[PDB]
């Protein structure tokens, strides 16, 4: 996250750290959102490489213990039918992690609350971006988890020729573009919270930026609509 502020522990239970294997360590690669004990929400161009996966739930401080840490293997991957390596501009970023085991929950492990299928936000609708994603175009991963307010670009906006014209689809969010404040490589999979009826749900999974940069102005955010695949999320989450 570009121009954010450090998060409280415990202000969003449902954002996890999905991690692979590297050597004898494990590296922070995507952020993610656990949407039940079992599963969690990511992109899904996170998990193109066929790599050895773990998920942290109850995660602050990538670099030392917090004492709330629950580790767990990633036991089924399930991506998007549709989605393509080649064309992130398609959409169809998503993917969906079974886990090992069952997680539990506290007060710093929750699940994230979906949007109702179809919901739309109106243009400049209060959103939070948070992760451990580059602080800087071309920086390094935070060590704390991240937030910065980023606001929605509506489609039509977001798709006007100043932005990002026809790259964005209706299946996407666009959120943020002042050049100030961004999501950044690392942050991809992860949430975009926004306060719906007194409730922080979830309705992006953050999927791309600008390749000129992470904070450019008029290249704002962009996710994958999560209340566009309610129903591929259901179906899933019953028949594995
Ligand atoms: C035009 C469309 C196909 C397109 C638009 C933007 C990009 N972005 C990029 O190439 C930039 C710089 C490196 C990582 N990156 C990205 O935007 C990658 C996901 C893109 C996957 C591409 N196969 N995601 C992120 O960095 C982020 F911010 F979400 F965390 C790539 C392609
Ligand atoms: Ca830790």
């Known amino acids: ?3 954010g502020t450090e998060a409280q ?3 969003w239970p449902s954002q996890i750290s999905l991690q692979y294997r590297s050597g004898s360590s494990w590296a922070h690669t995507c952020g993610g959102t656990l949407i039940r004990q079992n599963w969690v929400m990511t992109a899904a161009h996170c998990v193109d490489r066929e790599l050895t996966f773990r998920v942290v739930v109850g995660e602050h401080n990538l670099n030392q213990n917090n004492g709330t840490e629950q580790y767990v293997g990633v036991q089924k991957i399930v991506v998007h039918p549709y989605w393509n390596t080649d064309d992130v501009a398609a959409g169809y970023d998503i993917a969906l992690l079974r886990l090992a085991q069952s997680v539990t929950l506290n007060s ?4 994230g609350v979906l949007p109702r299928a179809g919901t739309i936000l109106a243009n400049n609708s209060p959103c939070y971006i948070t992760g451990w994603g580059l602080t800087r175009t071309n920086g390094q991963l935070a060590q704390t988890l991240q937030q910065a307010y980023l606001p929605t670009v509506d489609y039509a906006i977001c798709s006007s020729s100043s932005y ?5 689809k209706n299946s996407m969010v666009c959120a943020g573009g002042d050049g100030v404040r ?3 490589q ?3 999979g ?7 009826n007194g409730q922080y749900a979830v309705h ?3 999927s791309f930026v600008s390749r000129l940069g992470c904070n450019v102005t008029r290249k704002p955010t962009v996710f994958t609509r999560v209340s566009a695949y309610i129903s591929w999320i259901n179906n899933v989450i019953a028949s594995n």
């Open 1 to 3: 996250v570009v121009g």
């Open 164 to 168: 990002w014209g026809s790259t964005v």
């Open 182 to 184: 961004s999501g950044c």
């Open 186 to 188: 690392g942050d991809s």
């Open 108 to 111: 710093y492990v929750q699940l």
């Open 204 to 206: 992006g999974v953050t």
């Open 190 to 196: 992860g949430p975009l919270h926004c306060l719906v």
């Open 9 to 11: 522990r415990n202000s």
